[PDB]
Amino acid sequence: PAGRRQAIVEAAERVIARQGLGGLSHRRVAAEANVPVGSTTYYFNDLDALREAALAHAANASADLLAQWRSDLDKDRDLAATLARLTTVYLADQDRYRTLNELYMAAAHRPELQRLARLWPDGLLALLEPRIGRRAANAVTVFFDGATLHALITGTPLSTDELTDAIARLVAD
Amino acid sequence: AGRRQAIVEAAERVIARQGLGGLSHRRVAAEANVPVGSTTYYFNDLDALREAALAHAANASADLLAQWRSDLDKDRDLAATLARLTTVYLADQDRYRTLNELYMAAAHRPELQRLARLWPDGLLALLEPRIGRRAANAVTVFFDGATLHALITGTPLSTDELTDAIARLVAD
Ligand SMILES: CC[n+]1c(-c2ccccc2)c2cc(N)ccc2c2ccc(N)cc21
Ligand SMILES: CC[n+]1c(-c2ccccc2)c2cc(N)ccc2c2ccc(N)cc21
């Protein structure tokens, strides 16, 4: 299909993000992906495997973003401003990160979603801890978790300047 | 004690787990332990159960917010007082789980956002006069993450760690 299967994994991601894990059905995914049901059943008779597929696709996207953050943080050479920017870009990219966001929030009370979620907090820590210490590293990721949830809740993100200022206070000393 | 109440509290639970669209008399009958949806139908023929469930959580949220307000006037060290209160909140996850679930969920469900906003708007107005907009907003944001990240990572920031990060953020 040149990627009918890949559209079904990408739909299933959004599905699971919106309805949860035990809220996966072939009908929904076909709807979600705009493909015939038979394509879904043919490629993923077993829904557990569609679940695995959908979580791995998110996990890949998560770790992929993190590596990009890694690349940017070495090169740029200024910490607060870089992190401020990277966060801003992310807060703005509502398309295609909704899901990672839908899942990360859900994981808050859903152990089965935490292996996927912990990649963010663990990954950020590995990135920052060497550069700023672990107390600072933890405090910053705490703030970022807040920045996203707070932005979504209130409907307005912190500006880059506001982010930069708060990061700088958290990393100072 | 009162079966109305037990049904609105169960409905809160169900909304917290299955969203709002997931709410049904049947699910609530189970969560409530009401013998049959029949008591559920009696007290709430239609789903103005949502409105009661949402208002019950609003009342609980405002209430805790009033408690924070009281505890703040009752001391001087703002940072350490906010930390203590948060530490207590993280330690009472069991009491406050449904509120937390609803808050998380509201990130992508606009219908849960009027309830959810009582927190940020509330903390903002509470602290803004003491530390100004910038700091009050930065603290609320940090608190949003303090709870989420504690849940995700399974380890909360300590009182000392909370106090330290808050002190950095409030300082003019
Ligand atoms: C999906 C996790 N997550 C969150 C996040 C999303 C929702 C709530 C809390 C944190 C995040 C939040 C902010 N502000 C900035 C960057 C990231 C991020 C960056 C990379 C990644 N692989 C996951 C990331
Ligand atoms: C339910 C909102 N909420 C959150 C919160 C919960 C989950 C995610 C983000 C913030 C909260 C988080 C921390 N750290 C400390 C206090 C509160 C709080 C306090 C009162 C209230 N009425 C709602 C509150």
Q: Which CATH architecture has domain B1-172?
A: Orthogonal Bundle (1.10)
Q: How many other CB atoms are found less than 10 A from the CB of residue B118?
A: 16
Q: How many other CB atoms are found less than 10 A from the CB of residue A128?
A: 22
State how far Cα B67 lies from the chain centre: 13
**A152's tokens:** 């979504």
Phi, psi of B77 (to 5 degrees): -75, 90
Output the residue whose Cα is nearest ligand 1's atom 2.
A120
**Quick one: which atom of ligand 1 is closest to the CA of A97?**
1
Side chain identity, residue A145: D
User: Separation of A54 CA from ligand 2 center, angstroms?
Assistant: 31
Contact status, residue A16 vs residue A51, Cβ threshold 8 Å: yes
Contact status, residue A72 vs residue A86, Cβ threshold 8 Å: yes
Residues 6+ apart with CB under 8 A from A27: A37
Using left for φ > 0, alpha for ψ between -120 and 50, and beta otherwise, residue A133 falls in: left
Beta-carbon separation of A158 and B146 below 8 A? no
* Alpha-carbon dihedral A71, A74, A77, A83, rounded to 10 degrees: 50
Residues 6+ apart with CB under 8 A from A3: none
**Quick one: which atom of ligand 1 is closest to the CA of A123?**
22
Side chain identity, residue A89: V
User: Separation of B35 CA from ligand 2 center, angstroms?
Assistant: 34
Domain boundaries, chain A: 1-173
Beta-carbon separation of B169 and A170 below 8 A? yes
DSSP-H helix ranges across B2-112: 3-18, 25-32, 37-43, 49-73, 78-91, 93-106
Q: Is A105 on the interface with B (CB under 8 A)?
A: yes
**What b-and-e string marks burial along A22-40, b requiring 16 or more CB atoms within 10 Å of the CB?**
eebbbebbbebbebeeebb
- The resolution in angstroms reads 2.3
Beta-carbon separation of A170 and B171 below 8 A? no
Q: For residue A163, what are the CA distances in angstroms to A168, B15, B83, B124? A: 8, 33, 21, 17
State how far Cα A134 lies from the chain centre: 22
**Which chain B residue shows the shortest CA-CA distance from A113?**
B152
Q: How was this structure determined?
A: X-ray
Contact status, residue A4 vs residue A37, Cβ threshold 8 Å: no
Q: How many CB pairs under 8 A join A and B?
A: 116
Phi, psi of B19 (to 5 degrees): 75, -165
Does the Cβ of A127 fall within 6 Å of ligand 1? no
Closest ligand relative to A17 C-alpha: 1
Beta-carbon separation of A105 and B148 below 8 A? yes
Instruction: Determine which helix (DSSP H) or strand (DSSP E) holds B156, and give its type and residue range.
Output: none
CA–CA gap between residue A91 and residue A46 (Å, rounded)? 35
CATH number at A1-173: 1.10.357.10
Q: Is B133 on the interface with A (CB under 8 A)?
A: no
| SS3 sequence of chain A | CCCCHHHHHHHHHHHHHHHCHHHCCHHHHHHHHCCCHHHHHHHCCCHHHHHHHHHHHHHHHHHHHHHHHHHHHHHHCCHHHHHHHHHHHHHHCCCCCHHHHHHHHHHCCCHHHHHHHCHHHHHHHHHHHHHHCHHHHHHHHHHHHHHHHHHHHHCCCCCHHHHHHHHHHHHCC
Phi, psi of A29 (to 5 degrees): -65, -45
